[PDB]
Amino acid sequence: PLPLVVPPTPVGGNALGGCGIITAPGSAPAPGDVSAEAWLVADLDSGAVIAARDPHGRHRPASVIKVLVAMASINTLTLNKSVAGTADDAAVEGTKVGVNTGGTYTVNQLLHGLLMHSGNDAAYALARQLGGMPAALEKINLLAAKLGGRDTRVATPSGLDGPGMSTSAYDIGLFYRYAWQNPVFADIVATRTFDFPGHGDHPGYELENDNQLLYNYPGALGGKTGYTDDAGQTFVGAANRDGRRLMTVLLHGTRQPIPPWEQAAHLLDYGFNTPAGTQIGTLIEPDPSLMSTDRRVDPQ
């Protein structure tokens, strides 16, 4: 498939087009124990990009791209709506939360499995519920486009590598800023333990959130991990300290010299350590249609 057009001016501001580390004039040096080849630090409320490295460079997202199938689902599917599991859901590769034949799962439960344990089976199930893989990918990429994600083409809902798969640290920032503005999404990613339904002879179990930033970083709102052979380590994390809500995105990193979540902690530290109002660019606003919602009693 042909590559996506590169915009004539970097989206969010001219400064966001460069390689390497971009910071406001006079600012402190960026953390040196970050191995992410691309990253972003941004304000969730104002949309200000505080600092970045190759923010518009194109890289694979791995599992952090799950934000799009999650929001497509939250937007268009009823939370208590029951979805029947299939063997196809269980047949997907990678991490799974136990979605299978003979199982019934609410969209809500699938979303917790999707986001707390990166359940690829939950992703696949939601994709069928969005109308099967072709329709799901069309909706996911429509959502990406309507959020201004002009670097983003999604090959799979789960983040598994596929032809044409691409995103940027900026775009991922766009997607998670939008997602964190939805209380349903916010609640889920902040959730430490969740009762996941069993099925048939399979019993329910307590699902735990895999995200270490959530446990170890004070003020953390949570986040999302990822890794594939092509993407390397990816990570999104956010925190609220004294009303300042910062987000960091990491792409194409490694687990050296410190784990990805700890690299993220340092970038968040760096972000809080920059003066408020600092801005090298902005996360552009979603299409207006994405920011509002469109919705027995007869005389008898």
Ligand SMILES: *C(=O)[C@@H]([C@@H]1NC(C(=O)O)=C(S[C@@H]2CN[C@H](C(=O)N(C)C)C2)[C@@H]1C)[C@@H](C)O
């Ligand atoms: C998403 O990236 C893949 C899956 N989701 C998760 C996850 O979020 O942790 C894993 S990646 C897991 C992270 N730590 C491992 C690692 O760093 N190495 C093996 C080097 C892998 C799943 C694989 C989804 C695309 O399948």
